[PDB]
Amino acid sequence: MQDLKNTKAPVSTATLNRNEFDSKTGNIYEAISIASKRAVQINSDIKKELLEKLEEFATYSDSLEEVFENKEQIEVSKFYEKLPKPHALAVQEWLEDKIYYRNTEKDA
């Protein structure tokens, strides 16, 4: 699993160098497609980890109130919220050559 605590991906939108992004494939569109597929995978993994963590801190309350207050759950959710977005993590992985891609049609 990725070390989300020590990730170098930018938190917000940043001006990325297009030449570095498409250097490996020679086509910015192919790189964008690969990055988005990896971003979908990263988002799935992050959702699974967050769901497990929330289930660990989930408290069973039988009250019929519409608003609940769980400070530990709120803190965990805030920590996950402050992390970079999945697509930013995918871009950071792509820049660091941490994404493996293969074209099935070209290798057939």
Partner 1 sequence: MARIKDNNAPKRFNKISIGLASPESILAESRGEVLKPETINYRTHKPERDGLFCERIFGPVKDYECACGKYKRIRYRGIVCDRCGVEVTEKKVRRDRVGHINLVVPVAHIWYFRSLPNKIGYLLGLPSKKLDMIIYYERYVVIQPGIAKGPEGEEIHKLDFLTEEEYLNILESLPSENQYLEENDPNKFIAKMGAECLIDLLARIDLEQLSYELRHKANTETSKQRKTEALKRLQVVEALRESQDNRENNPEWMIMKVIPVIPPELRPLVPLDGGRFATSDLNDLYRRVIIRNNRLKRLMEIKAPEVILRNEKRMLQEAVDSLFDNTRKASAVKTESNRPLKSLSDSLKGKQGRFRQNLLGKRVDYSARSVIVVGPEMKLYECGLPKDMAAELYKPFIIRKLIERGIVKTVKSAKKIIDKKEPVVWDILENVLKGHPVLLNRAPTLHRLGIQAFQPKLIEGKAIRLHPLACTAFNADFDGDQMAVHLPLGPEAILEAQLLMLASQNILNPANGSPITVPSQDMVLGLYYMTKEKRSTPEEPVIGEGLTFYSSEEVEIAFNERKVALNAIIKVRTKDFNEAGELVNKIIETTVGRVLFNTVVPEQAGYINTVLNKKSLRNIIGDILAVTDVPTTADFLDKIKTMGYEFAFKGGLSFSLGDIIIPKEKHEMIAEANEQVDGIMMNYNMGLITFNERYNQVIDVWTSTNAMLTELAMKRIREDKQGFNSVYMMLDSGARGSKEQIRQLTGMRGLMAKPKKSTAGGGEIIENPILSNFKEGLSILEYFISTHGARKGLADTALKTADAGYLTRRLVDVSQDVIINTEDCGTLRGIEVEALKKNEEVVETLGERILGRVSLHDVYNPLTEELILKAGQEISEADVKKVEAAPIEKVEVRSPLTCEAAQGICAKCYGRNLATNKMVQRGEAVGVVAAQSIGEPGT
Partner 2 sequence: ARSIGPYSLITQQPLGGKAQFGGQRFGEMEVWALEAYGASATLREILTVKSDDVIGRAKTYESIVKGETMPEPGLPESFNVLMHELKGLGLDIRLEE
Partner 3 sequence: TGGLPRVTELFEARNPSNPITPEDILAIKGPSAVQQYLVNEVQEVYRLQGVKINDKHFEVVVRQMMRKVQIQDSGDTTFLENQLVHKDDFINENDEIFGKKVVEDAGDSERLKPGQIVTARQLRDENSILRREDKTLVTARDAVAATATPILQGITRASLQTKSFISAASFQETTKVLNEAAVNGKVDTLEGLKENVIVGHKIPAGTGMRDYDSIIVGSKEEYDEIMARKEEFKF
**Cβ-contact 86, 46 below 8 angstroms:** yes
Dist. CA 64–CA 69, nearest whole Å: 13
In a 13 Å sphere around the CA of 29, the CA atoms on its Cβ side amount to 0
Tell me which residues in 26-85 interact with partner 1 (CB under 8 A). 26-30, 32-33, 35-36, 39-40, 43, 50, 54, 58, 66-70, 73-74, 77-78, 80-82, 84-85
Q: How far is the CB of 5 from partner 2 (least distance, A)?
A: 20
Q: Which listed option, partner 2, partner 1, partner 3, none, makes contact with residue 34 (CB within 5 to 8 Å by class)?
A: partner 3
Q: Which listed option, partner 2, partner 1, partner 3, none, makes contact with residue 23 (CB within 5 to 8 Å by class)?
A: none
